[PDB]
Design an enzyme around this catalytic site. Sequence first.
Site, PDB file in Angstrom:
ATOM      1  N   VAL A 151       0.442  -1.371  -0.093  1.00  0.00           N
ATOM      2  CA  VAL A 151       0.129  -0.043  -0.020  1.00  0.00           C
ATOM      3  C   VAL A 151       0.459   1.299  -0.056  1.00  0.00           C
ATOM      4  CG1 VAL A 151      -1.623   1.533   1.160  1.00  0.00           C
ATOM      5  CG2 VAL A 151      -2.148  -1.308   0.860  1.00  0.00           C
ATOM      6  N   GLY A 194       0.977  -6.011   1.615  1.00  0.00           N
ATOM      7  CA  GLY A 194       0.358  -6.205   0.675  1.00  0.00           C
ATOM      8  C   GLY A 194       0.990  -7.096  -0.611  1.00  0.00           C
ATOM      9  N   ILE A 403     -27.132  -0.432 -32.680  1.00  0.00           N
ATOM     10  CA  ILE A 403     -28.718  -0.956 -33.303  1.00  0.00           C
ATOM     11  C   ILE A 403     -29.567  -0.334 -33.913  1.00  0.00           C
ATOM     12  CG2 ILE A 403     -30.575  -2.363 -32.816  1.00  0.00           C
ATOM     13  CD1 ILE A 403     -28.809  -4.101 -30.892  1.00  0.00           C
ATOM     14  N   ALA A 443     -25.191   0.768 -27.568  1.00  0.00           N
ATOM     15  CA  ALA A 443     -25.650  -0.240 -26.401  1.00  0.00           C
ATOM     16  C   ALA A 443     -24.910  -1.333 -28.055  1.00  0.00           C
ATOM     17  CB  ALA A 443     -26.239  -0.492 -26.046  1.00  0.00           C
TER      18      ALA A 443
HETATM   19  C1  LIG Z   1      -3.308  -5.543   4.003  1.00  0.00           C
HETATM   20  C2  LIG Z   1      -1.750  -4.626   2.819  1.00  0.00           C
HETATM   21  C3  LIG Z   1      -0.968  -3.675   3.331  1.00  0.00           C
HETATM   22  C4  LIG Z   1      -0.246  -2.717   3.040  1.00  0.00           C
HETATM   23  O1  LIG Z   1       0.217  -3.308   2.025  1.00  0.00           O
HETATM   24  S1  LIG Z   1       1.037  -1.765   4.008  1.00  0.00           S
HETATM   25  C5  LIG Z   1       2.160  -1.033   3.311  1.00  0.00           C
HETATM   26  C6  LIG Z   1       3.449  -1.500   3.663  1.00  0.00           C
HETATM   27  N1  LIG Z   1       4.841  -1.355   2.846  1.00  0.00           N
HETATM   28  C7  LIG Z   1       5.526  -0.575   3.341  1.00  0.00           C
HETATM   29  O2  LIG Z   1       5.853  -1.218   5.046  1.00  0.00           O
HETATM   30  C8  LIG Z   1       6.519  -0.082   3.115  1.00  0.00           C
HETATM   31  C9  LIG Z   1       7.646   0.498   3.578  1.00  0.00           C
HETATM   32  N2  LIG Z   1       8.927   0.670   2.713  1.00  0.00           N
HETATM   33  C10 LIG Z   1      10.227   0.554   2.970  1.00  0.00           C
HETATM   34  O3  LIG Z   1      10.369  -0.248   3.289  1.00  0.00           O
HETATM   35  C11 LIG Z   1      10.927   1.376   0.890  1.00  0.00           C
HETATM   36  O4  LIG Z   1      11.852   1.687   1.432  1.00  0.00           O
HETATM   37  C12 LIG Z   1      11.145  -0.154   1.013  1.00  0.00           C
HETATM   38  C13 LIG Z   1      12.392  -1.057   0.933  1.00  0.00           C
HETATM   39  C14 LIG Z   1      10.385  -1.463   0.186  1.00  0.00           C
HETATM   40  C15 LIG Z   1      11.889   0.230  -0.515  1.00  0.00           C
HETATM   41  O5  LIG Z   1      13.271   0.388   0.065  1.00  0.00           O
HETATM   42  P1  LIG Z   1      14.571   0.942  -0.771  1.00  0.00           P
HETATM   43  O6  LIG Z   1      15.834   1.378  -0.051  1.00  0.00           O
HETATM   44  O7  LIG Z   1      14.903  -0.188  -1.973  1.00  0.00           O
HETATM   45  O8  LIG Z   1      14.307   2.033  -1.747  1.00  0.00           O
HETATM   46  P2  LIG Z   1      13.401   2.364  -3.219  1.00  0.00           P
HETATM   47  O9  LIG Z   1      14.121   2.832  -4.333  1.00  0.00           O
HETATM   48  O10 LIG Z   1      13.341   0.765  -3.717  1.00  0.00           O
HETATM   49  O11 LIG Z   1      11.967   3.195  -2.658  1.00  0.00           O
HETATM   50  C16 LIG Z   1      11.869   3.112  -2.190  1.00  0.00           C
HETATM   51  C17 LIG Z   1      11.042   4.614  -1.595  1.00  0.00           C
HETATM   52  O12 LIG Z   1      10.120   4.885  -2.463  1.00  0.00           O
HETATM   53  C18 LIG Z   1       8.576   5.125  -1.487  1.00  0.00           C
HETATM   54  N3  LIG Z   1       7.624   3.792  -1.452  1.00  0.00           N
HETATM   55  C19 LIG Z   1       8.158   3.138  -1.016  1.00  0.00           C
HETATM   56  N4  LIG Z   1       7.386   1.924  -0.456  1.00  0.00           N
HETATM   57  C20 LIG Z   1       5.973   2.731  -0.481  1.00  0.00           C
HETATM   58  C21 LIG Z   1       5.309   2.696   0.345  1.00  0.00           C
HETATM   59  N5  LIG Z   1       4.555   1.331   0.623  1.00  0.00           N
HETATM   60  N6  LIG Z   1       4.005   3.925  -0.523  1.00  0.00           N
HETATM   61  C22 LIG Z   1       4.522   4.834  -1.075  1.00  0.00           C
HETATM   62  N7  LIG Z   1       6.336   5.360  -1.282  1.00  0.00           N
HETATM   63  C23 LIG Z   1       6.550   4.188  -1.025  1.00  0.00           C
HETATM   64  C24 LIG Z   1       9.600   5.801  -0.247  1.00  0.00           C
HETATM   65  O13 LIG Z   1      10.075   7.868  -1.146  1.00  0.00           O
HETATM   66  C25 LIG Z   1      10.310   5.315  -0.418  1.00  0.00           C
HETATM   67  O14 LIG Z   1      11.856   6.135   0.497  1.00  0.00           O
HETATM   68  P3  LIG Z   1      11.931   5.511   2.209  1.00  0.00           P
HETATM   69  O15 LIG Z   1      10.520   5.745   3.084  1.00  0.00           O
HETATM   70  O16 LIG Z   1      12.597   6.857   2.491  1.00  0.00           O
HETATM   71  O17 LIG Z   1      12.590   4.282   1.913  1.00  0.00           O
HETATM   72  C1  LIG Z   2     -25.741   1.627 -24.454  1.00  0.00           C
HETATM   73  C2  LIG Z   2     -26.909   2.952 -23.775  1.00  0.00           C
HETATM   74  C3  LIG Z   2     -27.045   3.972 -23.967  1.00  0.00           C
HETATM   75  C4  LIG Z   2     -27.689   4.859 -23.271  1.00  0.00           C
HETATM   76  O1  LIG Z   2     -28.131   4.630 -22.945  1.00  0.00           O
HETATM   77  S1  LIG Z   2     -28.312   6.352 -24.746  1.00  0.00           S
HETATM   78  C5  LIG Z   2     -29.177   7.467 -23.414  1.00  0.00           C
HETATM   79  C6  LIG Z   2     -30.415   7.996 -23.590  1.00  0.00           C
HETATM   80  N1  LIG Z   2     -31.499   8.467 -22.980  1.00  0.00           N
HETATM   81  C7  LIG Z   2     -32.523   9.173 -23.419  1.00  0.00           C
HETATM   82  O2  LIG Z   2     -32.135   9.474 -24.235  1.00  0.00           O
HETATM   83  C8  LIG Z   2     -33.306  10.198 -22.700  1.00  0.00           C
HETATM   84  C9  LIG Z   2     -33.524  11.461 -23.102  1.00  0.00           C
HETATM   85  N2  LIG Z   2     -34.159  11.293 -22.063  1.00  0.00           N
HETATM   86  C10 LIG Z   2     -35.850  11.764 -22.016  1.00  0.00           C
HETATM   87  O3  LIG Z   2     -36.371  11.414 -23.220  1.00  0.00           O
HETATM   88  C11 LIG Z   2     -36.469  12.062 -20.550  1.00  0.00           C
HETATM   89  O4  LIG Z   2     -36.977  13.586 -20.344  1.00  0.00           O
HETATM   90  C12 LIG Z   2     -37.541  11.043 -20.346  1.00  0.00           C
HETATM   91  C13 LIG Z   2     -38.678  10.703 -20.999  1.00  0.00           C
HETATM   92  C14 LIG Z   2     -36.808   9.429 -19.867  1.00  0.00           C
HETATM   93  C15 LIG Z   2     -38.252  11.268 -18.774  1.00  0.00           C
HETATM   94  O5  LIG Z   2     -38.917  12.983 -19.179  1.00  0.00           O
HETATM   95  P1  LIG Z   2     -40.157  13.182 -18.142  1.00  0.00           P
HETATM   96  O6  LIG Z   2     -40.763  14.287 -19.006  1.00  0.00           O
HETATM   97  O7  LIG Z   2     -40.941  11.513 -17.313  1.00  0.00           O
HETATM   98  O8  LIG Z   2     -39.713  14.235 -16.741  1.00  0.00           O
HETATM   99  P2  LIG Z   2     -38.511  13.459 -16.085  1.00  0.00           P
HETATM  100  O9  LIG Z   2     -39.051  14.429 -14.644  1.00  0.00           O
HETATM  101  O10 LIG Z   2     -38.865  12.144 -14.863  1.00  0.00           O
HETATM  102  O11 LIG Z   2     -36.720  14.137 -16.494  1.00  0.00           O
HETATM  103  C16 LIG Z   2     -36.527  14.621 -16.793  1.00  0.00           C
HETATM  104  C17 LIG Z   2     -35.410  15.230 -16.956  1.00  0.00           C
HETATM  105  O12 LIG Z   2     -34.768  14.657 -16.026  1.00  0.00           O
HETATM  106  C18 LIG Z   2     -33.317  14.399 -16.329  1.00  0.00           C
HETATM  107  N3  LIG Z   2     -32.507  13.493 -17.418  1.00  0.00           N
HETATM  108  C19 LIG Z   2     -33.891  12.708 -17.626  1.00  0.00           C
HETATM  109  N4  LIG Z   2     -33.353  11.421 -18.579  1.00  0.00           N
HETATM  110  C20 LIG Z   2     -31.683  11.853 -19.136  1.00  0.00           C
HETATM  111  C21 LIG Z   2     -30.492  11.598 -18.964  1.00  0.00           C
HETATM  112  N5  LIG Z   2     -30.456  10.266 -20.251  1.00  0.00           N
HETATM  113  N6  LIG Z   2     -29.282  11.801 -18.567  1.00  0.00           N
HETATM  114  C22 LIG Z   2     -29.377  13.161 -17.643  1.00  0.00           C
HETATM  115  N7  LIG Z   2     -30.587  14.353 -17.598  1.00  0.00           N
HETATM  116  C23 LIG Z   2     -31.509  13.517 -18.003  1.00  0.00           C
HETATM  117  C24 LIG Z   2     -33.115  16.056 -17.391  1.00  0.00           C
HETATM  118  O13 LIG Z   2     -33.023  16.890 -17.192  1.00  0.00           O
HETATM  119  C25 LIG Z   2     -34.806  15.947 -18.154  1.00  0.00           C
HETATM  120  O14 LIG Z   2     -35.630  17.548 -18.334  1.00  0.00           O
HETATM  121  P3  LIG Z   2     -35.713  17.397 -19.544  1.00  0.00           P
HETATM  122  O15 LIG Z   2     -34.656  16.828 -20.418  1.00  0.00           O
HETATM  123  O16 LIG Z   2     -36.103  18.961 -19.570  1.00  0.00           O
HETATM  124  O17 LIG Z   2     -36.550  16.198 -20.105  1.00  0.00           O
HETATM  125 CL   LIG Z   3     -26.953  -0.339 -30.210  1.00  0.00          CL
END
Ligand SMILES: C/C=C/C(=O)SCCNC(=O)CCNC(=O)[C@@H](O)C(C)(C)COP(=O)(O)OP(=O)(O)OC[C@H]1O[C@@H](n2cnc3c(N)ncnc32)[C@H](O)[C@@H]1OP(=O)(O)O
Ligand SMILES: C/C=C/C(=O)SCCNC(=O)CCNC(=O)[C@@H](O)C(C)(C)COP(=O)(O)OP(=O)(O)OC[C@H]1O[C@@H](n2cnc3c(N)ncnc32)[C@H](O)[C@@H]1OP(=O)(O)O
Ligand SMILES: [Cl-]
Lengths: 562, 558, 562
Positions: A151, A194, A403, A443
């Site tokens: 991490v 990790g 389509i 779609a």
């Molecule tokens: C569920 C799982 C949870 C987790 O994974 S918890 C995280 C546990 N990780 C650790 O304790 C790692 C502590 N790191 C070391 O000991 C690390 O120096 C290390 C031992 C690797 C690597 O040390 P190195 O001396 O080989 O230096 P590197 O050039 O490989 O990189 C180190 C450098 O990278 C960066 N670095 C390394 N690890 C991290 C991480 N993790 N996050 C952000 N940045 C990082 C950081 O700038 C580090 O500088 P220092 O802190 O001064 O050593």
């Molecule tokens: C792969 C798949 C791809 C896609 O899904 S493409 C998207 C296809 N969708 C459409 O053509 C929907 C066009 N909408 C209508 O005809 C829509 O009025 C509708 C016919 C529903 C609904 O119209 P209503 O008259 O029932 O008004 P509502 O209170 O239910 O909500 C309309 C309102 O919500 C909003 N609205 C509704 N649909 C969207 C969407 N999609 N995005 C963002 N905002 C939306 C918008 O502010 C709308 O205002 P107008 O544009 O003036 O009608």
């Molecule tokens: Cl389609």
Amino acid sequence: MYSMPGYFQNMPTIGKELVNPNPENEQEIKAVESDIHESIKKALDAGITSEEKLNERGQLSAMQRINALIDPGTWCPLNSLFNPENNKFGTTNIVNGLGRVDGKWVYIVASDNKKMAGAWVPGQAENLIRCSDAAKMMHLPLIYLLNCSGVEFPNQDKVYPNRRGGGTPFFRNSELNQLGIPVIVGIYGTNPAGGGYHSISPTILIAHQDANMAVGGAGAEQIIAAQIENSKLKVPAPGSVPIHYDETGFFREVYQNDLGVIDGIKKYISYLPAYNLEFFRVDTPKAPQLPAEDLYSIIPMNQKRPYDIYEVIARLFDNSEFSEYKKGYGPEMVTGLAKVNGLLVGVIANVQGLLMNYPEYKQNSVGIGGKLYRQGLIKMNEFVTLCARDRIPLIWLQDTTGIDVGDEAEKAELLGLGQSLIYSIENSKLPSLEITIRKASAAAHYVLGGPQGNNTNVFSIGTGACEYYVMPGETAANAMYSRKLVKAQPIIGKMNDMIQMYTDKSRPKYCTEKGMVDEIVDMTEVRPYIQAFTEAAYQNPQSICPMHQMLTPRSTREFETF
Amino acid sequence: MYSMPGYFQNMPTIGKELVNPNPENEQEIKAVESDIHESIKKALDAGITSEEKLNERGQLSAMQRINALIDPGTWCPLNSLFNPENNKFGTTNIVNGLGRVDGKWVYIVASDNKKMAGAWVPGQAENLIRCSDAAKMMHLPLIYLLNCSGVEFPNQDKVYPNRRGGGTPFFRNSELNQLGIPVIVGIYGTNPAGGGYHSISPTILIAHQDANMAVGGAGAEQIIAAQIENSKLKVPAPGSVPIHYDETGFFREVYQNDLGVIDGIKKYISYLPAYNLEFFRVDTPKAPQLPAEDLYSIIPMNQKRPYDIYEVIARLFDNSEFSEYKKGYGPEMVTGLAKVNGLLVGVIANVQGLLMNYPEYKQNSVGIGGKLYRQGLIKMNEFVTLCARDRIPLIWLQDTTGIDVGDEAEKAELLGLGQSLIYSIENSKLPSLEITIRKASAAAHYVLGGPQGNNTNVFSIGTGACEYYVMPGETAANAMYSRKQPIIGKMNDMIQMYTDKSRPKYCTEKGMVDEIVDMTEVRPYIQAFTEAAYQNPQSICPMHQMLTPRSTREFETF
Amino acid sequence: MYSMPGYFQNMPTIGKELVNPNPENEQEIKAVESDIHESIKKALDAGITSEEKLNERGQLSAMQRINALIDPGTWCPLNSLFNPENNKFGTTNIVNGLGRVDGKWVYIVASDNKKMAGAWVPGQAENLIRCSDAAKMMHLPLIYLLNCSGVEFPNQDKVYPNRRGGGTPFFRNSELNQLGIPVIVGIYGTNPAGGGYHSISPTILIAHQDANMAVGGAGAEQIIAAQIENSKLKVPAPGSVPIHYDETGFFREVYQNDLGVIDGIKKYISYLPAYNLEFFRVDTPKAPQLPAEDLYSIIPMNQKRPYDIYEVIARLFDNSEFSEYKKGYGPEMVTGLAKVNGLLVGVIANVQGLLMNYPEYKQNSVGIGGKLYRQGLIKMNEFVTLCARDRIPLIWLQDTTGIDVGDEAEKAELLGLGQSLIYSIENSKLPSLEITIRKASAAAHYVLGGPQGNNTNVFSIGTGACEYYVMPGETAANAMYSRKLVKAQPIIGKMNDMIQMYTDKSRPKYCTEKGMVDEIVDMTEVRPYIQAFTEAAYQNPQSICPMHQMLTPRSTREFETF
Ligand SMILES: C/C=C/C(=O)SCCNC(=O)CCNC(=O)[C@@H](O)C(C)(C)COP(=O)(O)OP(=O)(O)OC[C@H]1O[C@@H](n2cnc3c(N)ncnc32)[C@H](O)[C@@H]1OP(=O)(O)O
Ligand SMILES: C/C=C/C(=O)SCCNC(=O)CCNC(=O)[C@@H](O)C(C)(C)COP(=O)(O)OP(=O)(O)OC[C@H]1O[C@@H](n2cnc3c(N)ncnc32)[C@H](O)[C@@H]1OP(=O)(O)O
Ligand SMILES: [Cl-]
Ligand SMILES: C/C=C/C(=O)SCCNC(=O)CCNC(=O)[C@@H](O)C(C)(C)COP(=O)(O)OP(=O)(O)OC[C@H]1O[C@@H](n2cnc3c(N)ncnc32)[C@H](O)[C@@H]1OP(=O)(O)O
Ligand SMILES: [Cl-]
Ligand SMILES: [Cl-]
């Protein structure tokens, strides 16, 4: 050496040689791609400790560990730019994606030790779930290159608690294990709390000799005093090798350096069960007959322009071969079987352009390519269902504007049929890839094997020509504010605010930053991902249909002849 | 009329009569509770269209629809204050929780038609998933009281796309259906696009006569002109009754008014398969022997103070009876079987206070109640595994500050054993309730049947004495900044920020806990959960084939 | 009050009013039926202790207990004549089948206490498995009216050991329980060892006050002496009520007499989860428009005669309505949706008679109805797959003489397609009913939803016109002995031995005696069984497809219009 060549070899070929390149289009797409790569680069290099400083004190960066682990050129990063919470460093502090290891595809997660020692940052939990989910759906081994400080303290409220916070992956790792999917961890540096759980949840633990995993780690003027007075003891970081190798035996193996750990991982990867993909092939792997670079001219950035989908399909699949299911029925979609490195996939893709004298439920009508109609929806329903039966993974190429709307469409059952498709997808139970070619909207985005199918879509990728929105900003502006115009200038302000905001929040980079799409990939990277997905999906599938028992090819043939 | 009374009846009774009430403590808890109720109230009443205006034009609000649907007094709201994105109205535009309908428990989701006509708002998608998830894990029917205008246009980017956005529930509805769990929707008002899919994804569709479901709905100066010129036709809202009843037959039934729809839903609910709970009872339902009001004195708001967990357990479970598994082993935890309206549940709860001469892996040591040690972890592991085998749902009462740290603890396998518990929970496959009595902290929060077990935890609730954090702000401040005057500023910033962001209300607002419930509401939720879990369980262990009671007995005697 | 009347109501009606009755045919069928009833009667009455003697000492027979338990006229016995090992009494010492209890269908198993106190006899184990299997596949509560003395000592080797012997049901009862399916037992009389386990394996135990369940019961001249000297103690039968009610609490309830036990069972049955079938109806229950008695004229006992299958389907299903999938494609089969008490079922049935200008893969050919060809097989495959997706149970009406043979047929993929159907059925995962109208022969018997699909076929029933064989005796005689002719009168002897033996061992009674078919039912009992099956299958289904999300009706429609 393959079943049923009469069905599976010498399929119809598709696609033309590109006669008219479009340099300006190409330039527009490549501009998007360049911006992604630069952003990915800037993000990977961000953090207080550089790759240089890492190397100086004997450690590799996440990308060095990955590149060491994987077969060169097989890296398919996912969520490279995923940053839903806007962390300064631009990432979720993990690098993830698909890599191949000595021919075995595996899902890879690497802690970014450049950034706060691999700490849990906002968005990371979600990023991690997408990783274990992909592995789960594909039944693909999950590999952690772990260097995790747990991490991030200032952001604990965003990374520690909740159903899908940092504790979730440990359950997800147990689920993978219980599903029969192995998790392998290379343990590097300090992994407390990790980090400890990330270390202990996997199946196989390979430790660096200086690494540790622990329930808790070592972590006014007196506080500084107690520190040096508690550091002079040289008390060891809790759960170091002498503890988790020599005492608990939780670390199965211990290596001297990062590459050793990587080798250990490789060895255990080599132990994992995996088909020779030859088993599921219906053909020898063949490149497409048309180059992917053409995609830069074929797929238009001008969203008003159509294009021939077949030209895309010809460039993504083996030999530009394609076996279309029900060509002529549902002309707005292409659904058919293709091959990816010799392996069968089902492809479902939008057809673009006008469709004369269609749909059949309207008089004197023209259908819009990119939209979905009755025949398209039913066809896809059937095709998905057929592919499910046949255990054939589905690749969806989305370019959609929804389509068809209106009561005529409603009477044609369109709402029911779109949902029926959702039902079909959920029934399919197979891993699926979704590629957004251009438009992911309405779609239709959901029903076209959208990433909303959390049991089937492994992940989704997009090209630089892609964009995600409910509907175009102008349509949305009318839909939102038209009636409020008739209730009563501040309202037209709001409408332009909306059109602008829809443009801004639908750009490829933003979309992947929010994770709407997992990765923007280069036009020349689409097939590589398809190849990574398909081969991963066929590596260790949980279900088999023998080719001679497959229905899709039979039904396809019959539609052609009967 | 029950199996094995020798095991399941006349269990040891636990708990004392409360001799020393703590009015000030009570006042502190009730202050938290009051603030939750006021916030819930203010949130339910928010929106541009009031319940009054809704009623005037013939419509019921979400809560009126729910109250019409449910048996009075059986409402267990969840996510009342869930608002992870800070929407102005304070909610996710859905009301959800468990209600009982003529004795059948069902999961209920009602669109808040007071707010933007039930539009999808930021956080809603997540809220909705928690609903279908609960239904899925409990195999409990899901009821939508739908009045949904779809995507809220200004916030489309937050409500439309992504793996867990507004499209997800439609897949989730198909999954419920495929798992054999029915979804029933009452369709009200206009349901276009996003609303349409919410209308069409369920199993049973009951429509209001004026309602519609559609792929798309009816939705510079010319734009206003075209509107009135396109409204003069009186062209009907797409997918209205004449379409989806008379043509498609997608609406199975149509009623004149909101209450008609509700009756239609009731009828279909009455069709649904459900055990008479008597089938799974091992005893006749009995109230606890000690009043729940005492909890206001028993559970201390002063987080430094211990309390006797048995006093809590005595007030939450039938007859204050409890059959402890391995009493004396793992003294930091209580694990045992109890009864909720005659039905067996497994209870796992932290013991508080100092534990003399413990843990066994340390010389001259004192164990801290609320922490987890070797025996506690192994015991829970065994207990979860036993209950899993026996098909006995688990109720976790969390009040935890973590697993024991240090190399001695590490050598005792503690990390492995905590994860082993995670494995055991995931293996259990049964629906589980988690109740945060006070402290949800450290990885212990996860392993103690935490909500991070997305396949087992149906949801989680907390009392007003609860708080969620990685670790206390002061411990975190040291952990964060020790190794590093602007730095002591940051440390106090952290101690403060941990206090602020760990208050019950904030926690449930972010959904760390699904609902803050009154001390006197904890048992009702336990009762709702248990009865829902036993309504149509997907797996049965005959009582005479149950291992937990046998192993318990043997540990007592052998 | 129903979804989509446009699809599901006012389906095409089928069948003619019977203009030419065939009294002689009727007489032949009814002769077979009468012989079944007489044999069933003679078998139920067999045993050393009569129903009269049972009643005298306060006990009911199996049939009395069943009749007490069930709604009158809802008894669908199965395996009435099942006697694979030729036990003298003619049965397996259990009575079993489907009965309805206050509207709830349940599977019922009753120990025949007329015969060796309900002892395990050869064949019983198998009989019992068919019971728990049916319950499992339908997710239907299983009811035991138990009065079981365990292993029949002289036949222990046939009833005690092995993978599918007397111990198996106890595992099967645990599996039902784990699958969420409750088992309820009324415990009567003495149930030691084998009986004890039958008593203890169910979910709910309801005991008669004099009953017992136990690991072991009470069971040269000194042996007789020790008996009276060990009986004078009046030492109680092990595990009687004072033990299993008062001490262990294993008996949940105890009643004074047999009817009390039945009332206890009824109460617990009333507790069981069950849909009001109205939930799954698409229409109000309607009788067929044509009487079932006509079946006695329609279905010819002369196996050389065809008949119109539609006339059968018109008499078995609601309102004689039928929605045929792909009428005209695969004309050798009828596949379509029908209604049984308002509930959707998929029907798959052989068409009889000559099929002019068919199959399409042969020049100048005539197809034989009852055989299976390319289109039939593909059609069925699709239909099964569609119904599976839609969660619509399949009822197969078999009257078959096999898939088409020869290399033309082989090139038409027939072997692969028949197996593809097997694959489809196994993929369907739903409970299925198989009714043998006349011929169950060749591998066609297997692929037409045969009882060989142990995960899908709940059971199978046959009319009096039915017969089971690999192929006709004459064809088999040629196939077996033709080549041994050319190699060489004792061989033609063997051929007539075979033709005769095939006739003998393919008669309805023999077939059900061996369990090839579970029950021979009267022509007027076919629909009742369909009704029992369908309502049981929809009582508590483990999966749902909302009607508006069903594909079968959509694909059907499209084939009609497109
Ligand atoms: C569920 C799982 C949870 C987790 O994974 S918890 C995280 C546990 N990780 C650790 O304790 C790692 C502590 N790191 C070391 O000991 C690390 O120096 C290390 C031992 C690797 C690597 O040390 P190195 O001396 O080989 O230096 P590197 O050039 O490989 O990189 C180190 C450098 O990278 C960066 N670095 C390394 N690890 C991290 C991480 N993790 N996050 C952000 N940045 C990082 C950081 O700038 C580090 O500088 P220092 O802190 O001064 O050593
Ligand atoms: C792969 C798949 C791809 C896609 O899904 S493409 C998207 C296809 N969708 C459409 O053509 C929907 C066009 N909408 C209508 O005809 C829509 O009025 C509708 C016919 C529903 C609904 O119209 P209503 O008259 O029932 O008004 P509502 O209170 O239910 O909500 C309309 C309102 O919500 C909003 N609205 C509704 N649909 C969207 C969407 N999609 N995005 C963002 N905002 C939306 C918008 O502010 C709308 O205002 P107008 O544009 O003036 O009608
Ligand atoms: Cl389609
Ligand atoms: C793994 C599991 C293994 C086993 O099941 S081991 C078998 C254990 N079974 C016993 O010990 C049963 C002994 N039987 C009684 O006590 C049985 O009288 C009994 C107590 C029921 C029934 O005794 P009743 O006085 O009620 O007489 P009934 O008319 O119900 O039938 C008895 C009659 O049936 C016959 N019968 C009953 N049980 C069997 C069996 N089992 N095999 C063959 N024939 C049998 C036999 O002819 C019996 O005559 P007797 O031996 O003189 O009592
Ligand atoms: Cl911990
Ligand atoms: Cl055959």
